[PDB]
């Protein structure tokens, strides 16, 4: 039994956004939505087996914010280059016409942890049947993130995952068709 | 380009044999570069870069803090393992296997954990290309093992007896 639990937290400027999430063998156990101040389990069945006081997460964050100002002054505010993500698209299962499926947009190896992702069906943004995951931690100092799209496979529809980040020259767009 | 400032901290609990040998690793990263570590095997703070030195100085001179820190292997790491060991460690999701030609393809999808073996068949060690293990990000994995041209066999911790074609 060789495993690895990871308490990942951070604070980012100037976006003024923080995060607190737990990680088991590379998969999210849960995180805390700071705004609503509550625990959000990656899978619903988890809630039965555990609990986490969200207050502690917000507490940590506040300290993170603090420390961040300390780290900025210590490095003369010395900025750093941004790291562009690598986007990939693929279905969750084999794709069968008329058989509901899920498109997975995978943003990886990027930092800072802040991006804008847009699902596109036939060139139009989709706001229905769209999910996403918080910024997940990698072995290294870079981040990871997933976006999901519920869809019915047809030969007429074509999809695009559009990812915008400060490391790119222009929004990135990975394509996907049933072809 | 645009300037950014990130305070990033990863508190890592490592288990080599369940609660047998546990190791705590606290990692602190400023921007894209790590600057400070606390390895339970060292028991002390160690700066990874120039930037992490001031902290190491300060914290290492806090006897009760280091003391509380060393204990956290148990008070935190162990404590959590006994909790997760109930649902996360023993999680088994049976894979779904499908064979089809685009070049024959063996689709092994929707399975956990990621430990899995997919073999083409006598067995063929030639003309085999796979996408590699793919994490779905929802506690499920998938992989495509393709044979250049029949039987596809799959072994997995969730399967007492192997699955075939």
């Amino acid at each position: 039994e060789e495993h690895t639990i990871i308490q990942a937290e951070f604070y980012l400027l100037p976006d003024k956004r923080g995060e607190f999430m737990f990680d088991f063998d590379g998969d999210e156990i849960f995180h805390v939505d700071i705004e609503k101040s509550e625990t959000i389990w990656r899978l619903e069945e988890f809630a039965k087996f555990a609990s986490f006081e969200a207050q502690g997460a917000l507490a940590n964050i506040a300290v993170d914010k603090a420390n961040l100002d300390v780290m900025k002054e210590r490095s003369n505010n010395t900025p750093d280059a941004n790291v562009a993500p690598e986007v990939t698209v693929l279905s969750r299962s084999p794709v069968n016409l008329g058989e509901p499926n899920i498109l997975i947009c995978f943003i990886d190896k990027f930092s800072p942890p802040v991006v804008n992702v847009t699902w596109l069906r036939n060139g139009r943004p989709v706001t229905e049947g769209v999910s996403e995951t918080v910024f997940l931690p990698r072995d290294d100092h870079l981040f990871r993130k997933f976006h999901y799209l519920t869809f019915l496979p047809s030969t007429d529809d074509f999809y695009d995952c559009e990812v915008d980040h400060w490391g790119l020259e222009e929004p990135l767009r990975k394509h996907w068709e049933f072809e | 380009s645009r300037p950014w400032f990130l305070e990033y901290c990863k508190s890592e609990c490592h288990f080599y044999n369940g609660t047998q040998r546990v190791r705590l690793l606290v990692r602190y990263f400023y921007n894209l570069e790590e600057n400070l570590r606390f390895d339970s095997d060292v028991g002390e703070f160690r700066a990874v870069t120039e930037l992490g030195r001031p902290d190491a100085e300060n914290w290492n001179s806090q006897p009760e803090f280091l003391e509380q820190k060393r204990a956290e292997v148990d008070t935190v790491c162990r404590h959590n393992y006994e909790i997760f060991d109930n649902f996360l460690v023993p999680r088994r999701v049976e894979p779904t296997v499908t064979v089809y030609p685009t070049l024959l393809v063996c689709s092994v999808s929707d399975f956990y954990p990621g430990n899995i073996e997919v073999r083409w068949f006598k067995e063929e060690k030639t003309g085999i290309v796979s996408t590699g293990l793919v994490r779905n990000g929802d506690w499920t994995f998938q992989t495509l093992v393709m044979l250049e041209t029949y039987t596809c066999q799959v072994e997995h911790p969730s399967l007492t007896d192997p699955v075939t074609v």
Partner: peptide
């Protein structure tokens, strides 16, 4: 539904 433990963020400076 046991409670999960976590490391309190240390103070810098």
């Amino acid at each position: 539904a046991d409670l999960i433990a976590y490391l309190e963020q240390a103070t810098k400076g």
